[PDB]
Design an enzyme around this catalytic site. Structure first.
Site, PDB file in Angstrom:
ATOM      1  N   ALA A  38       7.465  -8.500   6.282  1.00 57.19           N
ATOM      2  CA  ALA A  38       6.911  -7.954   7.517  1.00 57.19           C
ATOM      3  C   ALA A  38       7.744  -8.356   8.728  1.00 57.19           C
ATOM      4  O   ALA A  38       8.019  -7.525   9.605  1.00 57.19           O
ATOM      5  CB  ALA A  38       5.462  -8.410   7.688  1.00 57.19           C
ATOM      6  N   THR A  74       0.824  -1.196   0.000  1.00 62.10           N
ATOM      7  CA  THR A  74       0.000   0.000   0.000  1.00 62.10           C
ATOM      8  C   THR A  74       0.866   1.257   0.000  1.00 62.10           C
ATOM      9  O   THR A  74       2.032   1.247   0.406  1.00 62.10           O
ATOM     10  CB  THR A  74      -0.929   0.007   1.214  1.00 62.10           C
ATOM     11  OG1 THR A  74      -1.759   1.173   1.177  1.00 62.10           O
ATOM     12  CG2 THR A  74      -0.119   0.008   2.501  1.00 62.10           C
TER      13      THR A  74
END
Lengths: 210, 242, 248, 224, 234, 209, 250, 142, 240
Positions: free
Chosen positions: G120, G72
């Site tokens: 992540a 994003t």
């Protein structure tokens, strides 16, 4: 080159209640299309009201659980038998998983317990330690079937906050029965561990064996 | 002189007469230990130990003063208890390694040489000290019965009869008499009786003492080390008393 | 962590002298005499084979070939000399032969030996060597050379010199008997005369050890066929040759 | 290691009411060549444990050395090494599984499949499986290799669940094991007619039978 | 005077054949407070008298748990007690992790003796200077061991170590037949231990602050009682 | 220390972008070789000496990587000289064989040297073949190189137990000559070395021209 | 000398590989020293090509794949009032239910923020480690660490492991008295780039329309960041001042 | 009883694995300036693309020595390897020559290499930290 | 007295001597035992006096003669622990020589190797010399019968014949007289039994005492093997 990884496909599911938590798993242990065993538990009580499961390559998950339990033993020795909180356990498991960053465990890990305020808590881990707290998570071969069943039954439809332990157990049993009817790798049995302020309770149910 | 001044404050040092005084002081430490004897019979060995009577709080079956190195090797020592325990542990390790490697129980001379080399290695550097124990060990192998005595210097010899400790002189005199009176040899049970007699004579003592006797005989124990049971021990004690 | 170091065995005295080096020099002065004489066409190195009567003299040799053109002798402690000779023979190959394809000149090998001896004085684990060495050699660009190396590692070149128990008298004789026109045979005769005054007992070919650095010896090469392959220049005289020279 | 050379085929095992039964053939193959006849693949440990090994023969001998060393080290300075401090099947399996997983993690594995069978000191049956990847599991019936595909279906018809264990006698279990071995000899090309069997019972102890042969073979309908 | 020339380190014998540094290490035990251990066929008990620096300080912990089935009490040098307790915990952890076994008490005693003997024959270190009492329960029943830092271990039904332990030891020896048969009644055994350790008190009284108890048994894991938990035993 | 591995990765990145015979005779041994040295198809040298001296009475001739052959021969010669000085004895062919075998086995075949070693020592006359990976073999007559097949054919044609020095020299020369004529790798001249028991070694440069 | 004897006195431990201290520490045999290392110890396969092994075994059925951070759009920019960080907060869905809002911005400390991209786990682990390092540095020097020092620490750390398999791209934003406001970008390739405006992720070109001046008010800057994220596309907003970061949410 | 060296690969890595060149500012990170390796050498690059013979050559002599010690232990006992190791440790420990790299004569005598030469002997082989004091600090462990 | 740090370690005294080495030499005579070694035409004979005054000892276990290799034998003067240490070291050295160089180790080379080790001991501060004297005998394939001796100082040398012990001077003088009479460096005999008898007679004449079968140990080295005689062999040799 020798391949050190394997697959013993199973299904696990963790749900956090208002003041309880549940971690369930199927007891089928398989290799390819063969059945190694029909009752091989994958959800373990690790002490201090924490339940753990590592689904995937069985040897790696067993090693991870063993290491975590030994670390808990040393934590009790070195800190005047202090109770290990669920968030601290999640941090320890993150460090244990990331310690194998370049030779990872081939597992997906779910832990469950009660937080400091007494609410149910479930933590989910990626294979190299990325973790998050969640209300509900299914993992394994039949997760894509179990999750829609719960989503249709519950609203995250009576809200999850007002469900009792028995209702959650019934929902888990129904979802696993449906998955057993639809998935070849799911069956034989289902084992559920429930964590409340009184401790950990085990329940077992039979599933279709074909 | 028994005290070498200027040459006794460090191990592995030669005196002007060629002596090593730390080893001699370890020998002095050995000479103050409990009296232990070993007798070599026709086809076996017998070990005898004089022990002090302790408190009733000690568990009777967990206090044994005769150590078993291997199923065919018996051993006793006089001097420092921890040094004796360390040497017995090393002997057990050597016997286990030999048996694993060559599928046979280790012969007594080879075991004696390995122990002697290990003990001698501790007279070479100033960072260690010689062992303060003298060890009488023995057993049975394919070549027969063997009895050896090993000293803090690493020197060991095979013996017809050996003694160590405070009452070493009287025990040695009795052993020499026994050898003289039995040129043909001696049996295992007669050896047990004579060992009891020699221990009693050497002790003759503050309040009381106990006697431990072990033996390894081809005819009696099938070439295995065993402690003397109640009947034979009582018979030996009665023979020693009268 | 007190075992990670050992204090120096050689230290300065208040007067400014290193005691262990002086005591090693004293031990050198108590050894058997050994001498060397440099001539125009060769160098002579001589020593006395002092010994038991039942010991075979030929088994133990105090003169050693270092390279086909370099030999050495000593005064002092035999085992230290033996160790140093083995090391020098190895170093001649490790540092020079496997690098340049040639044997080292005399001065460079002497320097290597001297460095090895010097390192024994900057140590907390070993005491200095107790020998003094006489090294004779020949090389293409420097001719014939004779050097003396002391236990401290210092070395100096000599026209003629002697070390050991009778060093002073031998030095006086050599000073009175040396000239720049001397020949190799004259040097051998002078060496025999100088050793005559030092040996107390039997003075024959069985109690004297002589070696020369002279012309090339094709008969000692061991093979034929290459004209440019020079033979060894180091040669140890036999007992018969020493007897013949003494009789004459 | 990194490749098998001399191998054995399969080991089968089951639980009955008072103990366990395990069995394995006596062949060491060299590819398609049936090279070595007379290889013992059941290793008795103590008076209460039997270890069955399938796979690489050299690694099997290494494991035998490890088991013997474990037995020897148990008795080191141990007076009651055979009465109350004797080795348990669980201890042996824990050690073996730790070794297997550690050598898997080193990319230097032992190419074997191992079954540990026995009776605990409290009378409980022990039957567990480990392999070269370190994967371990337990079941009332266990088998390795081809047996896992053919012996297990036959053995599960006798003992299908835990509740079936108290209903199974030693005779029925032994007959089932013998029939499974006969089927394996029928349908496994790397199998042998000679096999060894071991019964561990909480009452009668260890019974080790060698030189057993497959019998009653129906080679009669091939005439037409 | 002559002892002063031969007590420099642990690698030196005296001309009479004595190793004085080990003797001094053994003497260091009496500088600690009294601890008592006893056992029956079913249970083993430790009783410890704790000391404080002053009224504003806390009391020293004399009982340390090694494993769910085994523990110990200490008398002597604090650093040595810390080191040995950690070592025993490590050995028990290794046994449980590798073999799924409960470490035997006799094995622990042998390991402690082996570890302690090394410091008495090499240069660079010093001998340990703490005595230990080890209680445990295993497949051979209940066990009590006394460890002396020269590298010695003895197996006893009861004993006492520390300052003025002779009175407690004499009381235990006199009444051996009483507590040797207290089977299935932990309270009687604990009370016998309390009386034994009271036999060694000098112008002092047991309180809920200076008394520590520990018990292990057949179905009883190693448990430590401090404070009000020992109030009923006073 | 030792041979360096520096610039191995750099070199990988940049890349990404003779007839020799030995013959035994009744009182010694003979080794022979050709003198043609080539760099590909080009004749670099018409008179190249391929017979090398490990020790005054131990000689050898090699094939494969030329630099490796020369370096290994020189290293073993230095070791042999030091050992002879240490023991005060004449070097033995067995000792040189042992040193060569262990050195080549240490490098696991990465040193590309293939040798024929002949020699005479107080124990007698010896002839050996040495492979790069460390294997060694004994023989009465040996051949090596690209012309080894023709030379071996000649040797198998005219070899017998009772060979004099002259017969052995002629046989070795004929084998080298066959390799010269029938192999493009050989062709110029014949170098011989004769080692006889109790005598000095005889090195004949350009025995046949 | 007796230690040498023990080294030569005897198999089982060797097979268990527990004669090595690292193996004992990793399995918590001798204690919890494994959880006491300031520099974490990372296991590698004992083979000639660990990198190829990892790349082959990571680029291949169950949910056991390495979690990848959201791609994003994230924006960071600096003005006279501090720093504005805006992240599109659209949450991906799977076979799980979130207990609360999922944060795509790591709070390193009450004064430092980082942005997740790539792996992540790598971002979370190494930014927590960086927070520990910054805390230790501030305790030692009795002063708040500058943004340049922390970014350089992270860059050196990731450079030491370059090519091993790490995948991360982060923006370190901080306001100190000496440096003012400062933004660095650090990725797993070792690049460390100081900047004024950063737009990372899908739709970065649309969000790079930042109307930008060094005189914007706090409200104007927040509105501009929100509008830029919306043009790239809810939005999560962070305002970093000298006193720390403040979370707004929008 | 090994012949070819085994277990040569590293099993774990960390940024502080080289204790001698740790940064003083950030003790968890290495000091690249004092490493003096060119400044662009991450540790990970040393884990890949190595010549397969380098590890065999670097550990060959140690492997042969360990095999010899194991043989002595099997045949003679523990004391013989104990004494050999003690002698080697004593010789290596008391030798400190910061200006030289050649081995001692006594070490070569103990290793039975008095008259033996290998390529390590022929080929025995900055701005920052290559002085006597660095060697003193490394030797004393301060 | 060393009077300094030389009371413990091997460093130079002001006179230039190493007192620890001399004290090891003194220690070499502790056992009060004499040994003799002679060479035949094709054999070498060593004879060591055996003293077992204690009646409790087993005589068969008392020996100072060791078999180092197939062809090399060794006799040691000094305490038995250092003797056994040196024996094991020599065995290892001989085997390693055979492995490394492809042929059997000569006696003189082994003596030189042990002498180099002794030199290490003399020069190193933290290593003490062994208080023993070693005598290696063999029949070398190049040199024939061979006797070599090494001492704590690191000195080694070969001998036509040798004697070691407190009474070595008389034995050496008698050997010198016999060799001067015969004018040869070896014994002119063809059988090793005759050489053994001659050496026994020489020892008896030199020491002035009579020996029985249990008072001596005999070792014989031939070109094939080195072997030690038993009690019966020595008793047979005495009768002559």
């Amino acid at each position: 080159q020798f391949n050190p990884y394997g697959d013993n496909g199973g299904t696990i599911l963790g749900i956090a209640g208002e003041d309880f938590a549940v971690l369930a798993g199927d007891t089928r242990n398989i290799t390819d299309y063969s059945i190694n065993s029909r009752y091989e538990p994958k959800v373990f009580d690790c002490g201090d009201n924490i339940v753990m499961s590592a689904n995937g390559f069985a040897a790696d998950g067993d090693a991870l659980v063993k290491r975590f339990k030994n670390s808990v033993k040393w934590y009790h020795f070195d800190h005047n038998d202090k109770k290990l909180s669920i968030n601290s356990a999640a941090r320890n498991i993150q460090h244990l998983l990331y310690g194998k960053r370049f030779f990872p465990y081939y597992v997906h890990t779910i832990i469950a317990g009660l937080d400091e305020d007494g609410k149910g808590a479930v933590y989910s881990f990626d294979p190299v330690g990325s973790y998050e707290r969640e209300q509900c998570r299914a993992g394994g071969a039949a997760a894509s079937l179990i999750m829609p069943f719960l989503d249709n039954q519950v609203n995250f439809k009576k809200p999850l906050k007002y469900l009792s332990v028995e209702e959650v157990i019934k929902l888990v049993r129904d979802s696993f029965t449906s998955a057993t009817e639809r998935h070849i790798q799911v069956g034989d049995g289902l084992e559920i561990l429930i964590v409340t302020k009184d401790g950990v309770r085990k329940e077992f149910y039979e599933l279709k064996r074909d | 002189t028994s005290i070498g001044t200027g040459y006794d404050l460090s191990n592995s040092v030669f005196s002007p007469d060629g002596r090593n005084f730390q080893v001699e002081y370890a020998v002095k430490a050995v000479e103050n230990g409990t009296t232990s004897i070993g007798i070599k019979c026709n086809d076996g060995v017998v070990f005898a130990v004089e022990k002090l009577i302790t408190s009733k709080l000690l568990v009777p079956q967990k206090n044994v003063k005769i150590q078993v190195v291997d199923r065919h090797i018996g051993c006793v020592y006089s001097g420092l208890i921890p040094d004796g325990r360390h040497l017995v542990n090393r002997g057990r390790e050597e016997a286990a390694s030999f048996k694993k490697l060559y599928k046979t129980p280790i012969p007594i001379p080879a075991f004696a040489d390995r122990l002697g080399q290990y003990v001698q290695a501790h007279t070479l550097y100033n960072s260690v000290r010689p062992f303060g124990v003298s060890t009488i060990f023995g057993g049975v192998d394919k070549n027969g019965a063997h009895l050896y005595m090993l000293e803090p210097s690493g020197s060991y010899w095979g013996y017809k009869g050996a003694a160590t400790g405070k009452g070493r002189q009287s025990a040695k005199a009795e052993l020499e008499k026994l050898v003289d009176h039995h040129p043909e040899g001696l049996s295992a049970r007669e050896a047990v009786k004579q060992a009891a007699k020699i221990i009693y004579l050497a002790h003759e003592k503050e309040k009381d003492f106990e006697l431990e006797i072990s033996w390894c005989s081809l005819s009696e124990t099938n070439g295995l080390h065993k402690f003397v049971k109640g009947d034979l021990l009582q018979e030996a004690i009665d023979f020693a008393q009268k | 962590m007190t075992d990670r170091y050992s204090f120096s065995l050689t230290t300065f005295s208040p007067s400014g002298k290193l005691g262990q080096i002086d005591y090693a020099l004293t031990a050198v002065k108590q050894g058997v005499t050994s001498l060397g004489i440099k001539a125009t066409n060769g160098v002579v190195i001589a020593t006395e084979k002092k010994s038991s009567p039942l010991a075979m003299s030929e088994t133990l040799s105090k003169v050693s070939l270092l390279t086909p053109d370099i030999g050495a002798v000593y005064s002092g402690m035999g085992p230290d000399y033996r160790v140093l000779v083995d090391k020098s023979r190895k170093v001649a190959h490790t540092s020079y032969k496997r690098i340049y394809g040639e044997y080292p000149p005399t001065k460079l090998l002497v320097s290597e030996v001297a460095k090895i001896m010097q390192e024994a004085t900057q140590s907390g684990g070993v005491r200095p060597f107790g020998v003094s060495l006489l090294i004779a050699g020949h090389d293409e660009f420097n001719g014939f050379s004779l050097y003396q190396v002391d236990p401290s590692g210092s070395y100096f070149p000599w026209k003629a010199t002697a070390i050991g128990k009778g060093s002073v008298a031998a030095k006086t004789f050599l000073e009175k008997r040396w000239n720049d026109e001397l020949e190799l045979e004259d040097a051998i005769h002078i060496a025999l005369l100088t050793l005559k005054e030092s040996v107390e007992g039997e003075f024959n070919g069985d109690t004297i050890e002589l070696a020369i650095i002279g012309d090339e010896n094709p008969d000692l090469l061991g093979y034929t066929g290459i004209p440019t392959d020079k033979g060894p220049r180091f040669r140890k005289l036999t007992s018969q040759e020493i007897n013949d020279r003494l009789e004459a | 290691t990194q490749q098998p050379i001399v191998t054995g085929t399969s080991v089968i095992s089951m639980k009955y009411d008072n103990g366990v039964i395990i069995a394995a053939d006596n062949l060491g193959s060299y590819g398609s060549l049936l090279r070595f006849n007379g290889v013992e693949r059941l290793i008795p440990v103590g008076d209460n444990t039997v270890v069955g090994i399938s796979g690489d023969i050299s690694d099997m001998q290494h494991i035998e050395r490890l088991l013997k060393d474990l037995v020897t080290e148990n008795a080191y300075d141990n007076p009651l090494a055979d009465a109350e401090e004797a080795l348990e099947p669980s201890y042996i399996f824990e050690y073996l599984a730790t070794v297997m997983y550690q050598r898997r993690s080193k990319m230097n594995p032992l190419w074997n499949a191992i079954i540990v069978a026995g009776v605990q000191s409290n009378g409980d049956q022990f039957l567990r499986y480990v392999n070269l990847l370190g994967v371990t599991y337990s079941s009332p019936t266990l088998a390795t290799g081809f047996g896992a595909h053919m012996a297990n279906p036959l053995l599960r018809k006798v003992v299908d669940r835990e509740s079936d264990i108290p209903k199974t006698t030693v005779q029925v279990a032994e007959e089932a094991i013998v029939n499974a071995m006969r089927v394996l000899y029928y349908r496994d090309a790397r199998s042998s007619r000679n096999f060894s069997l071991a019964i561990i019972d909480k009452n009668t102890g260890l019974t080790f039978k060698k030189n057993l042969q497959v019998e009653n073979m129906k080679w009669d309908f091939a005439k037409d | 005077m002559f002892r002063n020339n031969y007590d420099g380190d642990t690698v030196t014998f005296s001309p009479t054949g004595r190793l004085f540094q080990v003797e001094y290490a053994l003497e260091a035990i009496k500088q600690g407070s009294v601890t008592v251990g006893l056992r029956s066929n079913t249970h083993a008990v430790l009783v410890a008298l704790k000391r404080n620096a002053d009224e504003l300080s806390s009391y020293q912990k004399k009982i340390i748990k090694c494993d769910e089935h085994m523990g110990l009490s200490l008398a002597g040098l604090a650093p040595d007690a810390r080191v040995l307790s950690n070592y025993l915990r490590q050995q028990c952890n290794y046994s449980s992790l590798v073999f799924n076994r409960k470490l035997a008490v006799e094995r622990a005693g042998h390991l402690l003796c082996d570890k302690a003997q090394k410091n008495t024959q090499s240069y660079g270190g010093r001998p340990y200077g703490v005595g230990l009492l080890i209680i445990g329960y295993d497949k051979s029943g209940a066990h009590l061991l006394e460890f002396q830092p020269s590298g010695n271990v003895t197996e006893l039904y009861g004993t006492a170590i520390g300052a003025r332990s002779q009175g407690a030891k004499t009381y235990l020896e006199r009444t051996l037949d009483t507590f040797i048969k207290i089977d299935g009644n932990p309270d009687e055994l604990i009370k016998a231990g309390v009386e034994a350790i009271s036999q060694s008190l000098r112008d002092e009284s047991l309180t809920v602050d200076n008394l520590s108890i520990a018990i292990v048994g057949k179905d009883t894991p190693f448990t430590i009682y401090d404070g009000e938990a020992v109030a009923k035993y006073i | 220390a030792g041979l360096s591995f520096d610039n191995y990765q750099r070199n990988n990145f940049l890349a990404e972008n003779t007839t020799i015979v030995g013959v035994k005779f009744n009182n010694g041994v003979v080794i022979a070789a050709d003198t043609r040295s080539t760099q590909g198809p080009i004749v670099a040298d018409k008179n190249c000496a391929k017979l090398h001296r490990i020790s005054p009475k131990i000689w050898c001739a090699g094939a494969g990587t030329a630099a490796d052959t020369e370096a290994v021969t020189q290293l073993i010669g230095s070791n042999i000289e030091l050992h002879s000085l240490y023991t005060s004895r004449e070097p033995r062919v067995v000792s040189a064989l042992q040193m060569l075998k262990q050195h080549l086995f240490k490098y696991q075949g990465h040193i590309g040297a293939y040798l024929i070693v002949a020699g005479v020592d107080p124990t007698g006359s010896h002839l050996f073949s040495i492979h790069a990976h460390g294997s060694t073999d004994v023989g009465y007559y040996l051949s090596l190189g690209s012309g080894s097949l023709a030379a071996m054919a000649v040797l198998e044609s005219h070899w017998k137990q009772d060979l004099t020095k002259e017969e052995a020299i002629k046989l070795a020369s004929d084998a080298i000559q066959a390799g010269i004529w029938n192999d493009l790798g050989s062709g110029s001249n014949v170098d011989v070395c004769v080692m006889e028991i109790g005598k000095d070694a005889e090195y004949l440069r350009n025995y046949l021209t | 000398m007796q230690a040498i004897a023990d080294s030569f006195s005897v198999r089982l431990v060797k097979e268990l590989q527990y004669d090595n201290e690292q193996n004992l520490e990793s399995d918590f045999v001798t204690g919890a020293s494994q959880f006491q290392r300031l520099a974490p110890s990372l296991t590698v396969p004992p083979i000639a090509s660990p990198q190829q092994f990892l790349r082959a075994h990571t680029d291949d059925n169950p949910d056991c794949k390495i979690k990848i951070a959201h791609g994003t759009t994230t924006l960071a920019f600096r003005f006279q009032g501090g720093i504005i960080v805006a992240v599109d907060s659209r949450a991906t869905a799977g076979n799980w239910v979130a207990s609360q809002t999922v944060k795509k911005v790591i709070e390193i400390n009450p004064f430092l923020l980082g942005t997740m991209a790539g792996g992540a786990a790598d971002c979370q682990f190494w930014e927590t480690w960086l927070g520990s390092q910054c805390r230790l540095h501030e305790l030692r020097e009795k002063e708040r660490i500058s943004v340049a020092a922390a970014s350089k620490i992270l860059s050196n750390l990731v450079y030491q492991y370059k090519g091993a398999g790490l995948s991360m791209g982060t923006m370190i934003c901080g306001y100190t008295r000496k440096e003012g406001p400062t933004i660095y970008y650090v990725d797993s390739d070792g690049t460390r780039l100081k900047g004024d405006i950063f737009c990372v992720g899908s739709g970065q070109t649309f969000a790079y329309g930042v109307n930008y001046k060094w005189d914007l008010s706090v409200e104007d800057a927040l509105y501009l960041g929100k509008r830029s994220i919306l043009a790239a596309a809810s939005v999560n907003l962070y305002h970093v001042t000298e006193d720390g970061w403040i979370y707004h949410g929008n | 009883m090994n012949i070819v060296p085994q277990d040569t690969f590293k099993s774990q890595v960390s940024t502080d694995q080289d204790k001698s060149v740790l940064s003083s500012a950030v003790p968890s990170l290495p000091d690249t300036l004092r490493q003096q390796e060119g400044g662009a050498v991450p540790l990970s690059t040393q884990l890949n693309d190595r010549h397969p013979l380098e590890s065999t050559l670097k550990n060959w002599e140690t492997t042969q020595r360990q095999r010899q010690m194991e043989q002595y232990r099997q045949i003679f006992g523990i004391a013989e390897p104990m004494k050999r190791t003690m002698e080697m440790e004593i010789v290596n420990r008391t030798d400190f020559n910061p200006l030289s790299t050649n081995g001692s004569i006594h070490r070569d005598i103990l290793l039975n290499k008095e008259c033996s030469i290998d390529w390590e002997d022929v080929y025995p082989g900055t701005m920052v930290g290559d002085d006597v004091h660095s060697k003193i600090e490394k030797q004393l462990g301060i | 007295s060393a009077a300094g740090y030389d009371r413990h370690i091997t460093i130079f005294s002001p006179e230039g001597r190493l007192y620890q080495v001399e004290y090891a030499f003194k220690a070499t005579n502790q056992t009060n035992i004499n040994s003799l070694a002679v060479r035949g035409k094709d054999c070498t004979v060593v004879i060591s006096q055996k003293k077992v005054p204690d009646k409790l000892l087993d005589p068969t276990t008392v020996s100072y003669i060791f078999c180092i290799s197939r062809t090399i034998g060794m006799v040691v003067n000094g305490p038995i622990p250092d003797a056994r240490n040196a024996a094991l070291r020599a065995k290892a050295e001989a085997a390693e020589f055979r492995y490394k160089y492809g042929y059997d180790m000569p006696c003189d080379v082994l003596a030189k190797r042990m002498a180099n080790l002794s030199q290490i001991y003399t020069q190193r501060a933290y290593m003490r010399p062994l208080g023993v004297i070693l005598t290696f005998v063999s029949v070398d394939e190049e040199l024939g019968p061979s006797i070599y001796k090494t001492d704590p100082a690191g000195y080694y040398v070969g001998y036509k014949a040798t004697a070691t012990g407190p009474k070595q001077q008389e034995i050496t003088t008698n050997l010198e007289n016999h060799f001067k009479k015969s004018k040869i460096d070896h014994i002119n005999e063809e059988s090793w039994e005759k050489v053994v008898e001659f050496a026994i007679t020489h020892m008896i004449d030199a020491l002035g005492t009579e020996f029985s079968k249990n008072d001596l140990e005999v070792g014989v080295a031939t070109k094939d093997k080195f072997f030690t005689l038993s009690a019966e062999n020595i008793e047979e040799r005495l009768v002559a």
